[PDB]
């Protein structure tokens, strides 16, 4: 079950880190703008 548990934490933390470092990566300027 530990082989599963490492994999679940890996996928979860990969997607959460992708989320956080996406929103730090210049979000409110990728609009149609003015």
């Amino acid at each position: 079950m530990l082989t599963l548990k490492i994999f679940v934490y890996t996928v979860v933390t990969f997607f959460v880190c992708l989320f956080i470092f996406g929103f730090l990566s210049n979000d409110p300027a990728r609009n149609p703008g003015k």
């Binding site: 079950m1 530990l2 490492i6 890996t10 933390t13 990969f14 880190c17 470092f21 990566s25 300027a29």
Partner: protein, 54 residues
Amino acid sequence: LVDERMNGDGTGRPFGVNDPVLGWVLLGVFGTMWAIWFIGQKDLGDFEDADDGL
């Protein structure tokens, strides 16, 4: 006992971590994603006071 199980309910451990092998994976994903982001910092907007707001 009869069988084998982690017995992780009711423990109260940080991030549900039991093995340090399980503990290293958090930093091993977080640091590499941070490093890819910090490399990708090259092609973004860095500035003195060019701020994005009213």
